[PDB]
Design a protein around this ligand. Structure first.
Ligand code: QUI
Ligand code: QUI
Ligand code: QUI
Ligand code: QUI
Ligand code: MN
Ligand code: MN
Ligand code: MN
Lengths: 8, 8
DNA sequence: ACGGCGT
DNA sequence: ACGCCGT
């Protein structure tokens, strides 16, 4: 759920 | 029902 | 009845 | 360096 690199 | 990773 | 990620 | 859900 977090998007820091992927944003799933 | 929500699809945030599975979407059932 | 449902599980996932890359810069 | 990052954590989330509803029909
Ligand atoms: C989002 O909050 C989140 C939490 N855990 C994960 C584990 C594996 C892949 C993606 C994820 N996303
Ligand atoms: C994004 O691509 C990414 C990759 N590795 C991580 C490790 C820890 C926190 C956030 C990250 N984000
Ligand atoms: C969707 O709204 C939803 C709600 N509760 C669940 C529980 C278990 C599996 C899937 C679900 N989906
Ligand atoms: C998606 O794969 C997924 C997995 N675990 C979760 C836990 C809490 C909220 C959303 C989630 N999504
Ligand atoms: Mn699960
Ligand atoms: Mn990775
Ligand atoms: Mn719920």
């Amino acid at each position: 759920x977090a998007x820091v690199x992927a944003x799933v």
